[PDB]
Design a protein around this ligand. Sequence first.
Ligand SMILES: [Ca+2]
Ligand code: NA
Length: 275
Amino acid sequence: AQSVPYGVSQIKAPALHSQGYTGSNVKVAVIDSGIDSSHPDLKVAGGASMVPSETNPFQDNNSHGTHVAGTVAALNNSIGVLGVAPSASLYAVKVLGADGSGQYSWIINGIEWAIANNMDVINMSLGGPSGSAALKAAVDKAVASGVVVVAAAGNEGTSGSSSTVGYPGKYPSVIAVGAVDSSNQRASFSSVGPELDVMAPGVSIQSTLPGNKYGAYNGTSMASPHVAGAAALILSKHPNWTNTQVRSSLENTTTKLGDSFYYGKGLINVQAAAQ
Ligand SMILES: [Ca+2]
Ligand code: NA
């Protein structure tokens, strides 16, 4: 028996699945800890590792990349969960080790791989407090190249009047995603600031874990893949739309939630965005 995690329903993904739009032929790169390609509820189309220590992107030592991957694209079958874009072509771009730590060079190499490999959407459920000119140039390049780039806003909460949006989420070319719960309430951990773009469900998100398991996690890393999945649904309905058009559609059709410093534009609604 399959279950639909609440976050998939919240963003109105089942409305698109009902129409027959499930993300088919859309290439999504999950730039994270790898994806357990053996999970019965996932199909991994390819990938590459950027970790010089761990060559196999298809082994997830951390769990994170597998959980993110299941929010984007857990298969529509009789088992497990359901992803936002269950027919999307998932690619595992390993940039983080078993510790969940990476190098900025590894991340940049993963972005570059995704551009060279004609990915449609990049998800980066990662962030740090410090950016780099090379990191900015990579995200900017991916955008200029036609990629939809989505990232977690960060789990820094509030800090006075300061923005707490991490990098690369802080860059204007990236869609930075904050986290709400099932009641549309911002999660206390969710980073804030002018650079926050949209919100998605990020509290108690059930998804796939390595070794044929399922579990729930909290974080803006869990909100991000809802938006990356949403961009894959939009492209499956409108394959001729640019990344610019996908982004605008998602930002312009949100359910407004509260002050933009805390909530950005509000909650994404894929049914409205898919127009
Ligand atoms: Ca399933
Ligand atoms: Na941003």
